[PDB]
């Protein structure tokens, strides 16, 4: 631990000079990122668009875009555009296949799984078991190995990233596991996707616009493996469905803002644009130096270790302050920008609320140590 | 009579974008002014000046407001309007929620996807009596309800697929009297039938006759009913101490969609509600008129119908569809092809629909009837 200087990547630059102007500082893009003005202008095309020919006719003139946004998220996760539908967002995304899940509702998860995520799973009538983990919450690959071939599950839902903390879960070993156990395995990339190697072999992706690949709200993925898509029986319409069309079709069915995923697959499109390697080396590169700069805070210890290629740092308390106030601090005070997380976002791992930095990669040295500063003088 | 000049028209027309041709689809999705436009693009823009969820904080106001329009346009409450996706998001909300035995009356010209979520949450479905429009008989629906009562009756107060306006006020006192409430689907008729009625709970869709964004709806729930509802997600036996109202509404949602829809209803209140139905009927009236008289189609709805949907049957066996994709082709008009899942069981044979908006002059119903004769 003798601390390194931040490389200079032109790319930090590219993407604060192609966004709005942020009125203080933002440190919250695990929470909601920053529409690109090309993502914000692609958004309201649609809708004069929309004006100009019709609603629908419009969103049928929007299918190579939306294609486009498929195509996008099927080659950052090693799948076909067409095995990858729309949806609300993650949340929507686990419900609608839990909810369509065939036969004995067996789940096996982390102990650091996101509050919202066991909520839709018990609400589906699943049993949820914890994998070991160890004193971070990392899933330790050989015994997860050895106990799901002794005590099967009828799939691992793996959650890559935490909402809540910033270790890297080793996703595709995990993977490997789960098939050699003949086990499916669903991965929650909402702060995966745009930030980890999501290429990793599983059976089921979802994913949310907001976050790293800086999307609009109200828009996620999830793509299912067509031998899984198949097996699925969805919730609406019923099995029994005059109707007939695919289960992709069943769970892409329903009004949705069709503008703000024409904006998504901009958004996705400026992250391939980018180059998804060197945006990755950059977020784990921004991690690494926001624990750097936070290492020395009297009142705040760093959670995460160091090198998790990872941009999400999270401070405990260590004189028992209230993250969700000094985030209103921080906002009211010093437009500095921040996620307080409660117990409830994974609360069979957390015994203490944690304050969450999530910078992008236009964050600077300077900005880490104006908020390192800002976090002192919190009264 | 007909040459009605309503500054209201013209106004609405310059309000919002130039359509390319002619639009006769509001019904389906219309058109968002340059207001509502601009304040969806503004908030997309807050969110990237001062992050997400502290511009959502700062909208309160707006989307507040919002629900206070909705409100006074039902008789509701603001606090008992909550957010949605649109109407199907709405139905499957209540009804997945629906404590206790889940049996229903309904008509028999029910919205196909409303009759999906209805089976789809374990409810039986029986038909309420009508007239050969398909419009309920109150005082008949009122014996069979004493006779055979039923946990609600669910009103589609107007259709997707034709454009009779339902008694709703009177059939919602009958149901009341029975002791039974009323849930009423008003994707339709939410700024253009009166949707105060006195319903124990009412929905609608944004890009429709408020022409609000897409992706937006709302459901308002009586507080009486409201708190006797158990939502699915989170489970019942949580310990998470939200209002159902509060969990009915929980999720990832377009915040500068739900802005764009508080200005789309400040809109309509703003031109005057009432003024507004008024040329929504003449429009109505105006479309039928111009329509009787077109070999190859006949004019669905009785020409009083105080609605803009009018909807033909084609009489030598054409296929909508295809006349509404050539009349976009080949025109530049814009239509909806109603099929039989629309309303499996009140429709024989598929229809041809427009729902213009009050902008629409009699010369434009003219071309489209021109259009509609030379249509291979
Ligand atoms: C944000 C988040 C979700 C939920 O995403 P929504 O789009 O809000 O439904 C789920 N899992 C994780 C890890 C998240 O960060
Ligand atoms: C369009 C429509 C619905 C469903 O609206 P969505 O917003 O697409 O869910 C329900 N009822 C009627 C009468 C409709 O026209």
């Not at 998860?109 to 996101?114: A, I, S, T």
């Not at 995966?192 to 907001?210: M, W």
């Not at 790293?212 to 097996?231: D, I, K, S, T």
């Not at 906002?331 to 997380?341: D, K, L, S, W, Y």
Request: glycine residues 8%; hydrophobic residues 45%; charged residues 20%.
């Amino acid at each position: 631990l003798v601390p390194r200087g931040s490389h200079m990547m032109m790319l930090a630059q590219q993407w604060r000079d192609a966004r709005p102007k942020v009125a203080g500082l933002h440190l919250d893009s695990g929470a909601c990122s920053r529409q690109s003005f090309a993502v914000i202008d692609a958004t309201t095309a649609h809708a004069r668009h929309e004006a100009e020919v019709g609603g629908y006719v419009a969103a049928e003139a929007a299918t190579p875009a939306l294609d486009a946004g498929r195509a996008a998220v099927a080659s950052l996760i090693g799948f076909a555009a067409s095995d990858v539908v729309y949806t609300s967002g993650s949340n929507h995304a686990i419900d609608l296949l839990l909810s369509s899940w065939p036969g004995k509702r067996t789940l096996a998860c982390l102990p650091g799984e996101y509050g919202p995520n066991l909520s839709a799973m018990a609400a589906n009538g699943f049993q949820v078991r914890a994998l070991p983990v160890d004193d971070d919450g990392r899933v330790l690959v050989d015994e997860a190995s050895h106990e799901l071939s002794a005590h099967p599950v009828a799939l691992v839902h793996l959650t890559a990233l935490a909402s809540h903390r910033g270790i890297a879960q080793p996703a595709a070993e995990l993977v490997e596991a789960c098939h050699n156990a003949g086990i499916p395995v669903v991965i929650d990339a909402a702060q995966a996707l745009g930030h980890l190697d999501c290429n990793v072999g599983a059976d089921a992706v979802y994913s949310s616009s907001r976050k790293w690949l800086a999307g609009p709200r109200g828009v996620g993925v999830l793509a299912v493996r067509p031998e899984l898509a198949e097996r699925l029986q969805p919730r609406i319409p019923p099995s029994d469905w005059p109707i007939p069309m695919s289960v992709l079709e069943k769970l892409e069915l329903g009004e949705h803002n069709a503008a703000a995923r024409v904006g998504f697959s901009v958004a996705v499109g400026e992250h391939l644009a980018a180059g998804p390697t060197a945006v990755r080396e950059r977020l784990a590169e921004v991690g690494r130096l926001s624990r750097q700069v936070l290492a020395e805070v009297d009142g705040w210890r760093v959670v995460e270790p160091v090198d998790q290629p990872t941009a999400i740092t999270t401070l405990e308390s260590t004189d028992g302050a209230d993250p969700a106030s000094v985030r209103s601090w921080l906002i009211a005070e010093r437009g500095i920008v921040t996620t307080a997380c409660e117990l409830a976002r994974a609360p069979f791992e957390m015994r203490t609320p944690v304050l969450r930095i999530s910078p992008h990669v236009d964050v600077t040295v300077d900005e880490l140590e104006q908020f390192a500063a800002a976090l002192r003088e919190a009264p």
